[PDB]
């Protein structure tokens, strides 16, 4: 009766079902966990918000078209405005979190296409001016739940002030490496003939036990159309991709007044 | 004559010393001495002060 295709995930007051999954990935074979006393750093008693924040938050959906080049988000950035997770994040200097990432995209037995879904530690991307290096604004690096998109062209700016955004060039993974090698990162593929969802469970990954969430994104989430969407009755059709993410084993230190980042 | 001692740990054993000279002044650095007693400077008081108690009673 039980199947690699059928799964339920419950966190807090939220549950996901899927009937066309393809197993699930646990990044680097490691489930998230709380920070042990023998690896701890800040000494204040941490806040562990548990069910208030460790639950599924669904981002705005994006549309997959035959011309789409792909999508990216950063974490914890994408969830910074999400319920009590966002509040705990911004009221504290330090935070750590794992995640369950659930990417959703259904179609029909007559559609075709394949999405690569990658979780990338320290997903540093190229800037869009050749007058400077590493020249990206905080606002452009941290778009929040809207994330960003890839392009198949690189057109760096004429003036440095106008190029302070990512050059998210698809085939170079926005960072000077070939996209065909992205499979070295934890990943699944949503191949429409096979499955309608991808599930990745991510431990906290960093060179530190805990860090400043408002300064530093630990993971990138990349969705690339490896094989273009095609549907014979209407090649211009669009199907939604929906991203739902739950923080896990969240832990925060260094409580004070709330952080309100710059918006422009 | 050889002394075998623990090394200071690195990124990811023991070491051996033999003294070659007849004067101790010739020797390499003294071994790590973790001795300390900050209280002789931080609390050189005649009557014991218990932290949780009033300093002046």
């Amino acid at each position: 009766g039980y199947s690699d295709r059928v799964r339920q995930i419950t966190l807090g007051n939220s549950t996901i079902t899927t009937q066309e999954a393809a197993n699930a990935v646990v990044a680097y074979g490691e489930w998230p966990s709380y920070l042990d006393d023998k690896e701890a750093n800040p000494i204040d008693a941490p806040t562990e918000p548990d069910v208030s924040s460790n639950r599924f938050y669904t981002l705005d959906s994006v549309q997959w078209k035959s011309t789409s080049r792909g999508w990216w988000w950063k974490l914890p950035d994408a969830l910074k405005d999400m319920g009590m997770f966002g509040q705990n994040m911004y009221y504290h200097y330090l935070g750590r979190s794992g995640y369950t990432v659930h990417v959703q995209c259904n179609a029909s037995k007559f559609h075709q296409g394949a999405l690569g879904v990658f979780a990338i530690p320290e997903y540093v991307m190229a800037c869009n001016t050749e007058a400077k290096t590493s020249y990206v604004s905080y606002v452009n690096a941290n778009p929040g739940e809207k994330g960003g998109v890839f392009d198949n062209a690189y057109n760096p700016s004429a003036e440095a002030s106008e190029g302070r955004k990512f050059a998210a060039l698809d085939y170079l993974l926005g960072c000077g490496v070939l996209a065909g090698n992205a499979f070295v990162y934890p990943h699944q593929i949503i191949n429409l003939r096979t499955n309608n969802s991808a599930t990745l469970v991510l431990p906290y990954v960093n060179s530190l036990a805990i860090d400043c969430m408002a300064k530093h994104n630990n993971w990138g989430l990349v969705i690339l159309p490896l094989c273009k969407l095609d549907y014979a009755p209407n090649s211009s059709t669009e199907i939604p991709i929906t991203v739902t993410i739950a923080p896990m084993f969240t832990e925060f230190n260094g409580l004070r007044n709330i952080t309100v980042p710059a918006t422009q | 004559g050889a002394q075998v001692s623990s090394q200071k740990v690195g990124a990811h054993v023991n070491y051996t010393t033999i003294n070659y000279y007849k004067d101790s002044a010739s020797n390499a650095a003294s071994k790590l001495d973790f001795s300390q007693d900050p209280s002789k400077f931080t609390e050189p008081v005649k009557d014991i002060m218990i932290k949780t108690a009033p300093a002046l009673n």
Partner: peptide, 27 residues
Amino acid sequence: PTAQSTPLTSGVNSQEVPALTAVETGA
């Protein structure tokens, strides 16, 4: 020998007042 570890502690409501002292003592 290492520098001091930090013990697990919660709050207090007590006549023990380690936050106050008198540095006139020379301590």
